[PDB]
Amino acid sequence: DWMPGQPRPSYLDGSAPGDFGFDPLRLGEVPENLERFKESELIHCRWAMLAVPGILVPEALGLGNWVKAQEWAALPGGQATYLGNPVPWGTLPTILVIEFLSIAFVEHQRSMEKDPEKKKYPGGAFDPLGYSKDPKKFHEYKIKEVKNGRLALLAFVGICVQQSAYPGTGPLENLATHLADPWHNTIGNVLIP
Amino acid sequence: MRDLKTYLSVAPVASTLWFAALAGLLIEINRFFPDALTFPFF
Amino acid sequence: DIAGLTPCKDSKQFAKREKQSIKKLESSLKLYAPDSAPALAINATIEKTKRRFDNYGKQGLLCGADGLPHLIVSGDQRHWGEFITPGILFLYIAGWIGWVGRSYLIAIRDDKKPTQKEIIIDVPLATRLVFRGFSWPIAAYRELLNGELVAKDV
Amino acid sequence: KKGEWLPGLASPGYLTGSLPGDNGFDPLGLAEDPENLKWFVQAELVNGRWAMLGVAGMLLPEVFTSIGIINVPKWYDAGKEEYFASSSTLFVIEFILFHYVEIRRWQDIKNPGSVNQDPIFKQYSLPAGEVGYPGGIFNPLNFAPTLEAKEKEIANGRLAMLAFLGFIIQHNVTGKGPFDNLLQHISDPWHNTIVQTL
Amino acid sequence: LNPSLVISLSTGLSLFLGRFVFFNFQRENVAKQGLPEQNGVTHFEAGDTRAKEYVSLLKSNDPVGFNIVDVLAWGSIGHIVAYYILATSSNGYDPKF
Ligand code: CLA
Ligand code: CLA
Ligand code: CLA
Ligand SMILES: CC(/C=C/C=C(C)/C=C/[C@@]12O[C@]1(C)C[C@@H](O)CC2(C)C)=C\C=C\C=C(C)\C=C\C=C(C)\C=C\[C@@]12O[C@]1(C)C[C@@H](O)CC2(C)C
Ligand SMILES: CC1=C(/C=C/C(C)=C/C=C/C(C)=C\C=C/C=C(C)/C=C/C=C(C)/C=C/C2=C(C)CCCC2(C)C)C(C)(C)CCC1
Ligand SMILES: CCCCCCCCCCCCO[C@@H]1O[C@H](CO)[C@@H](O[C@H]2O[C@H](CO)[C@@H](O)[C@H](O)[C@H]2O)[C@H](O)[C@H]1O
Incomplete structure (x- = not known):
């Protein structure tokens, strides 16, 4: 349960990967839209999981940040x-x-392609190591991918908003600026100019 | 007596009393605080 | 300043208006004996004029090329006294009036002859209800949440 | 006989007498609906408690400072002082923490008993109490939460809310601290009064 | 820079995409969306003499059904992209970063 004390939605029983009962706008009320949303959510999660290190690692090296x-x-x-x-x-x-x-x-x-289950988890050529072996471990890996990808999405939001709050920056440049003086370098200065 | 209070409760009479009070109030406020395009006390 | 305006404290046209007004009233004043009552009246208008222009200058009103105050209603925090603050006061009073009138209509609606109290006011009931408007924002917010503000299926 | 704020006046029917601090006082009928009454009971509890702490932290550091035992800025001048963190940082900290806690308390208001346990440590839950009186870790000395205890909590809360109102309005008109106001008054009371203050 | 090069590349790529890539999508959408109809029936059945579609031109010995109309559409796209890249290359326009 994402929010303890709150009744879970009628259509979210917890069985789905990453289903913690969060849809306060009832956007998954229609099942077709919900399935489409599971696919699209995984697509964003995977693009983000690829794009976050592609943003950070060239910054750790001498190469420019993701903006430059x-x-x-x-x-x-x-x-x-x-x-x-x-x-x-x-x-x-x-x-x-x-x-x-x-x-x-x-x-x-x-x-x-419309399986529709392959639109989320196709596998085959995309699972050569065969991590879909144990359906229990494969499903736990589904929770793994969904939480990792949601995390990456949140991080990407942090990168874009920091970039707007410090034009011409880097996530690690922002981080170092914070590590210098955490009590005087904060989002507090951006929220309160 | 009861009938007279009733008459004084009727729509036009209650309206003249009410708006006459309101007019005296607003007049006196503009007498002690004349002009004023703004709320100056902030 | 804002919108190309200048503060009225810094406006030549504003001070020219105050000057021409005061000299006008003094031109009227030259006709009467200084002890007379018309004289004291024109002096009172003069003092009230100086108070007016001095207050507009003090409270930070911007002026146009016309030498007259212009109001900044954009929400700029330097000018909330020109709209936002009197506006909140207005909404408080208007909400008070409407909330009280609605309270009266609800109170008399189940009477045997409702219209009877609409043309002859139940002043005791009205006096009981007038001060509900003091807390009208809490009452109306609570009604909106509770579902008592809006009639069902209308 | 549950106590009358206006002796002659009767109590509103919806004030049973089962609530602590019930003196029959709701002249504008805000608590006529029972859900409103619940919500306003929690609201009076929290406003009253915060008001007690605030009035304390505003008045006592001043009287200590003026006696000379310590040196602490005035409650209104405390904000301008220099601290080990930017005030913006302080604000973001305060906001995040209150955003967590207040929403847990709110979960208890809507669905009582629902947030009683630590979501991290599945042991160390709270005992089942009443809405607005969390037991367990929140009552380490394990005092008895009875009437007269709750009634005293509400009484000191109401006196402290009035107190806070007096502090802010006083400081607005007088430009000084509350204990400074009390000293000024005790000096020459018949000539030092809100009458002379205006 | 060379017009024949850009126009031939863009038009060849457009025909290619429309032939081996987007053809099935195109056909399933033009099939589910179907012929325009007035009052529940096609314009020709409703009596518009000139609203009968031309099945002669649409017949193609191209195995998949790619016909003259497909050529015209995708080739039009390729020429619009082509003259877009041509006209946009000779601009000299540069935004101030
Ligand atoms: C919480 C209780 C409380 C206490 C005991 C005091 C005490 C005092 N006030 Mg304060 N005050 C209060 C509340 C209180 N006030 C509130 C709620 C407000 C907001 C309106 C004010 C605003 C206020 C102003 C503007 C001024 C004072 C002033 C004063 C001092 C002189 C009294 C005076 O001039 O007229 C008193 C003014 C009032 C508004 C009285 C309202 C208090 C209500 C009626 C509750 C008190 C009733 C209570 C049952 C009797 C005492 C109980 C007490 C022992 C707890 C005095 C030491 C003056 C001062 O500071 O001296 C320079 C002055 O200028 N007060
Ligand atoms: C576009 C990305 C995306 C998509 C398609 C989904 C899709 C889905 N999510 Mg997921 N989620 C996302 C992002 C996304 N999520 C992010 C970033 C987080 C981290 C906060 C989460 C965390 C999360 C949890 C914990 C759960 C879900 C759940 C669900 C499923 C049911 C909810 C639903 O149907 O809403 C569909 C969503 C959309 C149609 C997208 C609407 C986007 C709107 C229009 C704009 C959003 C604005 C955004 C706040 C901008 C702020 C950034 C910054 C500028 C301030 C569903 C398949 C629930 C579930 O059952 O899991 C399977 C559930 O438990 N999500
Ligand atoms: C922590 C992130 C994470 C997790 C736990 C998963 C989990 C899963 N994925 Mg997914 N995926 C991810 C990220 C992730 N994915 C990314 C970044 C992409 C690229 C967009 C994809 C694209 C994808 C596809 C297309 C498919 C899956 C499939 C699966 C499922 C079975 C295969 C598997 O377990 O792989 C195991 C994963 C790991 C052991 C993680 C290894 C991490 C190392 C460090 C590699 C990272 C190196 C570098 C940083 C990135 C460059 C790699 C790149 C060049 C390929 C499973 C539930 C398959 C499926 O659906 O099964 C039926 C499948 O079809 N994923
Ligand atoms: C929360 C509160 C005060 C909290 C103060 C705090 C935290 C102070 C904090 C700080 O000081 C520290 C500690 C350190 C300082 O350096 C800085 C500051 C920031 C100063 C007061 C509430 C104050 C709340 C008040 C005064 C509420 C009054 C409500 C009334 C009187 C309602 C009455 C009626 O509603 C009934 C009951 C029935 C209806 O029918 C009729 C009517 C009349 C409407
Ligand atoms: C036989 C065959 C073949 C071949 C084919 C070919 C060779 C083709 C051709 C085709 C083509 C090659 C086509 C084209 C084109 C088309 C079109 C249709 C066009 C167009 C254009 C346009 C439309 C233009 C426009 C414009 C103008 C006019 C002006 C301005 C500019 C612009 C652009 C706008 C193969 C072997 C493959 C296979 C088998 C069979
Ligand atoms: C009612 C419940 C919630 C209430 C929430 C109240 C939030 C209050 C937010 C206060 C905002 C702090 O605002 C910020 O204060 C700091 C600290 O003095 C000021 O900072 C000031 O003193 C510091 C001291 O070093 C200097 O660095 C700075 O040059 C100077 O401006 C900032 O200029 C102001 O932007």
Whole structure:
């Protein structure tokens, strides 16, 4: 139960992975919408779980933060740098056409499959190590993925809001600024200018 | 007597008494606190 | 300042208006013996004029090129006295009146002849009910939560 | 005979006499509906308790400071002082903590007994009490929560709410501290009064 | 920079996507959405002499059913994207970061 003392919704019995009874707006009242929401929630969770380290790790290294790493495309002759290497295809129209064709193909492949249970957990080629072996352990891994991904989503929100509250920052730069003086470096200064 | 209080409770009479009191009040307030485009006490 | 205006304490046009007003009243004052009652009246209007302009200057009103106060209702905290604060006062009083009248109508609605108390006021009941308006925001909020504020299926 | 705030006046029917502090006082009929009465019982409890603590922390540090035993800023001047954290940080701390606790208490108001146990440690729960009087860890000395005990809690709470009102309005008109006001009054009472203060 | 290059690439990619990628989606949507109808019946059955769709042109020996209309639609897209990239490359426009 997400909120002790609160009656769980009628349609949330706790059986689903990551189902703690949280839908205060009753957005899953219709079952079709709820299933679609489980799929989409997992998609966001996995994009976030991939994108958070892609945001943090290049910052720990000498490379720019996640904001600076997008900046060459604003200027016309822009060329990307992967690990300091001016990659030749780094021009914006190149990687842009590449990204459109590749992403569009893959994601549209997800659009043209309706199991619907495979739209959440397809497996097969995407489970070569076969972690779907024990359905108990596979379901516990479902709770694992859902909580990890929700955590990553919250973290991403923290990164975007910190970026708005300190334009041209880094999550770890913000963290270090806090570690300097935690009692005088806080969200309190942003909430209260 | 009871009938007279009843008459004095009737809509137009109660209205003249009520708005006459309200007018005296607002007049005196504008007498001790004239002009005033704002609530100055903050 | 705000909206290109200037504080009335800093406005030449504002002070020119005060000057021309006072000199106008003094032009009227030159006609009467200084001990006379018309004279004392024009002096009272003059003192009231100075009080007016000095108060508008003090309380921070902005002026236009016209030399006249303009009100900032955007919500800027420097000017809540120009709308937001008198506005909250108004909403308190209006809510009071309407809440009391509604209390009266509910109180007489199950009488044998309801209209009878609408044209001849039950003044004792009204006096009992007038001071419910003091706490009208709590009463109306509690009714909204309890479902007693709005009639069902109307 | 449960006590009359107005001797001649009768009690509202909805004030049974089972509530502590029931002197038959609801002239604007705010508690006529029973759910309103429950909610306002909790509201009077919390406003009264916070008012007791606040009145204490406003008045006693002042009288101590003026005696000279310690040196503490005035309750209104305490905010401007320098502290080991930015006041914004202090605020965010206070807000997060109160946001947790108050919502647990509220869960008890809506669904009594629902939040009685530690959600971390599944042991160390609370005993079943009444709404607004949590037992267990909240009563370490294990005093008996009876009438006259609750009635004294409510009485001191009401006197302290009135007290706080007097503190803020007083300080507004006089520009000083409450104990400073008491000294000024005891000095020459017939010539030091709200009459002369205005 | 070379118009024939960009137009040929964009139009070839558009025809390609419409042929091997988005064809099934296209057909299931144009099938479930169906022909426009007035008063519960198609415009031609309702009596509009000119509302009969042209089944001759829609027949194609292309195995999947890709026809002249598909060519026209996707090729139109490819030319609009193509002249978009062409016109946008010769701009010299650059936003101030
Ligand atoms: C909580 C009880 C309490 C106590 C015992 C006092 C005591 C005092 N007040 Mg205060 N005051 C109170 C509440 C109280 N006040 C409240 C609720 C308000 C908000 C309206 C004020 C606002 C106020 C102002 C504006 C001033 C005082 C002033 C004073 C001092 C002189 C009295 C006076 O001038 O007129 C008293 C003024 C009142 C408003 C009285 C209201 C108190 C009500 C009636 C409750 C008291 C009744 C109680 C049963 C009798 C005493 C019980 C007590 C022993 C607990 C005096 C030491 C003056 C001062 O500070 O001296 C410079 C003054 O200027 N008070
Ligand atoms: C878009 C991402 C997304 C999606 C699609 C879902 C989908 C779902 N969630 Mg999940 N969740 C999310 C994000 C998401 N969640 C995040 C970020 C957290 C961490 C706080 C959680 C934590 C969580 C818990 C604990 C639970 C769920 C549950 C559910 C399921 C039932 C609730 C529902 O149907 O609402 C559907 C949701 C939507 C249609 C998305 C609406 C988004 C609105 C329009 C905007 C939101 C604004 C947002 C607050 C912005 C603030 C950020 C910042 C700018 C301030 C459902 C399949 C419940 C469940 O049963 O699990 C299976 C449950 O127990 N979620
Ligand atoms: C802690 C995060 C987490 C967790 C617990 C899970 C859990 C699960 N996933 Mg999921 N997933 C995740 C993240 C996660 N996923 C990410 C980031 C992606 C990429 C978008 C996916 C995409 C995905 C797909 C497509 C599928 C699953 C599947 C599954 C289920 C069975 C397979 C399995 O257990 O994998 C075990 C997971 C681990 C042992 C975690 C290993 C973590 C290490 C450190 C790798 C990280 C390295 C680096 C940081 C990231 C780069 C890797 C990248 C290049 C691939 C299971 C419930 C399959 C399924 O549905 O089963 C039927 C399946 O089809 N996941
Ligand atoms: C919570 C409260 C005060 C709390 C004060 C606090 C925490 C003080 C905190 C701090 O001081 C510290 C400690 C340290 C300082 O340095 C800083 C500050 C910040 C100063 C007062 C409540 C005060 C609450 C009050 C005064 C409530 C009064 C309600 C009344 C009189 C209602 C009466 C009626 O409603 C009935 C019952 C029946 C109806 O029918 C008729 C009417 C008349 C409507
Ligand atoms: C036989 C065959 C084949 C081949 C085919 C081909 C070769 C094709 C062609 C096709 C094509 C190649 C097509 C195209 C195109 C189309 C279209 C339809 C177009 C268009 C255009 C437009 C529409 C334009 C517009 C505009 C203008 C006019 C002006 C301005 C600019 C713009 C753009 C706007 C294969 C082997 C594969 C297979 C088997 C069979
Ligand atoms: C009623 C229940 C809830 C009540 C909640 C009340 C919240 C009150 C929030 C108070 C906000 C604190 O506001 C903040 O205070 C600090 C501390 O003095 C001020 O800070 C001031 O003193 C500090 C002392 O070092 C200096 O660093 C600073 O230059 C100066 O401005 C900030 O300028 C002000 O923005």
